[PDB]
């Protein structure tokens with residue numbers, strides 16, 4: 001397999017389906033990436049993550065540099081070996097904590113977090129090298145929402161300067177440049193002209209893929225969709241488009257309708273541990289007393305191992321009792337559900353009936 | 368398979384190895400039973416419990432009657448169906464909480480716990496029927512340690528009266544009597560004459576197996592062994608002997624040397640979640656900083672899936688980070704270790720070299 005090759009097999013309107021080939025494996029798109037922030041997809045063995053259908057998982061520069069340490073992971077043979085996942089890993093650059101943990105001194109050089117730690121385009125790229133990430137994100141600044149046009153512009157301009165520095169850092173590291181891929185991240189808040197400037201800047205630098213950054217930060221679905229409407233067409237058509245931090249199933253569906261190829265969110269894992277289970281008729285809260293004697297599986301159509309074997313009643317008991325198997329079963333099902341969602345999306349695009357699928361999905365999910 | 372058949376295949380001194388055949392499966396003895404108090408062996412799927420080598424698991428009348436409820440579990444098709452374990456289940460009778468949660472009003476009729484709940488020989492037997500346990504324990508009173516001879520005698524005499532009531536309750540329930548087995552529980556504290564009276568009383572009533580109760584309650588290994596020395600020979604030789612609540616690996620080994628066939632303890636599961644891992648060179652605490660960069664598996668000889676795939680360093684990180692996969696991996700290994708211990712015990716008895724195995728095990732484990 002090549003370092004990186006993205007091929008589009010089918011389209012319907014702005015939506016597309018295809019594959020990313022990398023050295024550690026093939027990624028089917030549109031893809032959902034389970035989040036493995038602390039070098040584990042919470043409450044799941046990697047074999048189980050794979051069994052649900054995941055092709056790639058997400059790691060995090062910020063968290064892994066704090067614990068257990070980037071250099072330590074490298075000494076131990078890299079993140080893949082460490083956690084026992086041998087397929088592709090995408091790592092975020094720490095740019096989102098630059099905003100969410102704002103503990104912080106910011107400058108053109110980078111960000112200092114307070115023990116004190118530094119992040120910069122160069123250090124972020126180096127850390128992702130130490131981890132051995134397959135898909136490296138540029139170091140950026142996720143602009144807070146809401147932002148004035150002036151502040152959004154200043155922030156986006158700094159991010160584009162940091163994007164160039166990330167590109168150069170990545171390329172100066174021979175082994176990284178030859179074996180991994182680098183994605184740039186578009187910023188510009190909700191403003192069309194700034195999104196355009198950012199897209200132009202990123203394309204001039206040149207990346208393997210392009211993420212839409214700065215969204216899923218409280219703007220709401222209407223506004224996110226409005227921004228995607230003009231923003232995704234700005235990006236190179238022949239490269240993958242990654243919407244960072246999205247999201248709920250309806251968000252994913254609408255985003256694919258608008259040209260997005262890649263997704264990540266903690267929702268299936270986190271909310272799984274909190275008792276929310278996704279079904280084709282919408283989410284349920286398994287803690288609810290109405291499930292105490294319900295012998296049906298979490299979802300009536302789901303093909304996952306959890307739904308093959310255990311009842312709502314049992315999982316209800318486990319979650320109420322705070323039992324670890326509760327978290328395990330809920331999380332496996334929720335991740336399996338998301339992967340079944342992506343599979344149905346890929347198949348419907350391949351067959352030219354994605355518009356109808358979107359319509360059918362929503363009618364039932366929000367009944 | 369029969370309702371219950373215990374066959375002894377080999378002996379060495381007081382130790383023996385053989386099988387218990389029941390309708391839901393065969394139990395190899397000496398056996399270790401993982402504890403599944405809240406209708407789950409904590410942090411493990413039943414398939415994983417089986418993969419470690421377990422033939423039978425332990426459930427608890429007291430806990431399951433409180434949550435989720437005995438009648439509810441019965442309406443849902445029984446404990447096996449509920450939790451997804453289709454092999455034998457032994458349930459304790461609630462007799463040990465009669466002492467540990469002493470919240471309690473006690474009388475010849477039974478025990479009232481405070482919502483208020485009642486337990487008695489008749490109610491305990493009924494609850495274990497509702498759960499669908501394969502091996503039912505008689506309702507007893509675990510005498511506190513230390514106890515005066517007079518108080519130990521009074522308590523033991525009440526337990527023997529309760530043993531008769533349990534026998535009669537069990538036999539009056541046709542489906543239970545035809546499909547499950549009933550074990551009596553010896554009491555009498557550390558006093559030889561009272562242990563003898565209890566054994567005589569239990570044998571006169573007649574049970575499928577006999578447990579040594581009232582031990583592993585703070586008496587220490589020397590005293591426990593001293594009591595086992597004269598107590599186990601009092602029990603019917605041709606029936607299984609179950610030492611309740613034991614224990615550490617050295618306790619198990621010495622107990623088998625003294626004629627015990629069956630064991631249960633929370634140690635591998637509970638201490639597993641707390642970071643203690645069992646190895647042939649003794650337990651280690653994986654939280655210790657010395658394991659932060661240790662690439663070796665938890666144990667160098669262990670055949671479990673955990674030791675095949677992940678390092679001490681990774682599990683150290685997970686446990687320090689409070690990650691659920693940490694508990695999962697530690698628990699799987701610890702239960703696998705206990706089952707490997709039992710297997711080595713069975714094989715050494717079969718080959719007439721158990722004495723040597725005991726000696727070799729201790730020399731290395733306590734080096």
Ligand SMILES: Nc1nc2cc3[nH]c(NCCN4CCOCC4)nc3cc2c(=O)[nH]1
Nearest residue numbers: 092093095096140142213214215216244245
């Ligand atoms: N480097 C980089 N990473 C991003 C990551 C993002 N994540 C989100 N939204 C979701 C945030 N989650 C919500 C659930 O709790 C955890 C944080 N929005 C995100 C935006 C970015 C971004 O612009 N840059």
Ligand SMILES: Nc1nc2cc3[nH]c(NCCN4CCOCC4)nc3cc2c(=O)[nH]1
Nearest residue numbers: 459460462463507509580581582583611612
């Ligand atoms: N019905 C009945 N059940 C028993 C259960 C016993 N368990 C123990 N010792 C271990 C207690 N564990 C120690 C670890 O924390 C949980 C309780 N000792 C036990 C003794 C009995 C007994 O005499 N009767």
Ligand SMILES: [Zn+2]
Nearest residue numbers: 302304307333
């Ligand atoms: Zn499912």
Ligand SMILES: [Zn+2]
Nearest residue numbers: 669671674700
């Ligand atoms: Zn192991």
